[PDB]
């Protein structure tokens, strides 16, 4: 990254749902390279969500993402030999990445006896606006706002 930006990996669309976002989700929940297990987990979670709501799962997943997608984030900046928490606007890709990572992690420390159930409940409450990832986005936006004085550099 000293000599310039690095190329991105064009990961492919999911076969059985046809969306990019689910493949991003499986690659986030992936562990130790066990791709089949991650796909089983995510498909089970999506089907659980479809059963609970009664509609297509991808639209609810997008709704949850938009509910948890952040817009303003805080980074430590060193200007003139001093460090401050500076609120910064977030590019779309970084916002989606942050949303997905938050969803996966906060579902990982749920209490639903299974990864599929934990993930399904987390995505449902995110779609409804009650999830812990939604709360995390609330705190990050509050943190960005409370430091708006330092946005001028």
């Amino acid at each position: 990254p000293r000599k310039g930006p690095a190329p991105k990996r064009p990961l492919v669309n999911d076969p059985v749902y046809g969306s990019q976002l689910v493949t991003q989700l499986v690659n986030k929940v992936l562990l130790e390279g066990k791709k089949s297990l991650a796909e089983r987990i995510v498909y089970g979670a999506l089907e659980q969500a479809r059963e609970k709501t009664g509609t297509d799962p991808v639209v609810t997943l997008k709704r949850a993402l938009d509910n948890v997608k952040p817009a303003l984030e805080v980074r430590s900046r060193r200007v003139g030999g001093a460090t401050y928490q500076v609120p910064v606007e977030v590019r779309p890709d970084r916002s989606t990445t942050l949303a997905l990572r938050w969803l996966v992690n906060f579902s990982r420390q749920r209490r639903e006896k299974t990864m599929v159930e934990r993930l399904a409940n987390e995505i449902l409450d995110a779609s409804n606006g009650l999830g812990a990832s939604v709360k995390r986005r609330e705190d990050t936006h509050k943190m960005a706002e409370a430091n708006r004085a330092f946005a001028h550099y």
């Binding site: 060193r78 200007v79 003139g80 030999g81 001093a82």
Partner: protein, 126 residues
């Protein structure tokens, strides 16, 4: 401050003197010391004018501080090591009093590497 001394061969009393002299530097360090090791080594060849060599290593909150000296006996080597370590610790301080003179500060003065660049308008001053 707990110091482990790993000598070799013949150096009676070097360990206690070195431990007691080094352990007094804990207060001089501005950050907690995580580890402290001292090694004493004597040169076999009698032709060597300063046979004894002493080395130290302190983990000052993750920052590695080390020094190495030579002497004609255990006491002199340990004392020179203590002086050298004190100098290194002084140069390592990094608290506010240590970097208050280096802060670019100097509003529109003393151009430094991290000095705040001047804000420039799009149009020429004229």
């Amino acid at each position: 401050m707990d110091v482990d001394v790993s000598t070799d061969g013949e150096l009676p009393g070097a360990a206690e003197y070195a431990r007691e002299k080094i352990g007094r530097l804990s207060r001089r360090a501005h950050r907690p010391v995580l580890h402290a090791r001292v090694r004493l080594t004597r040169h076999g060849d009698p032709a060597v004018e300063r046979p004894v060599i002493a080395q130290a290593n302190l983990d000052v909150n993750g920052r590695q501080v080390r020094a190495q000296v030579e002497g004609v006996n255990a006491r002199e080597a340990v004392d020179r090591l203590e002086a050298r370590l004190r100098s290194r610790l002084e140069r390592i301080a990094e608290h506010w009093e240590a970097r208050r003179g280096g802060v670019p500060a100097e509003a529109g003065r003393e151009w430094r590497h991290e000095s705040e660049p001047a804000r420039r308008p799009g149009y020429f001053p004229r």
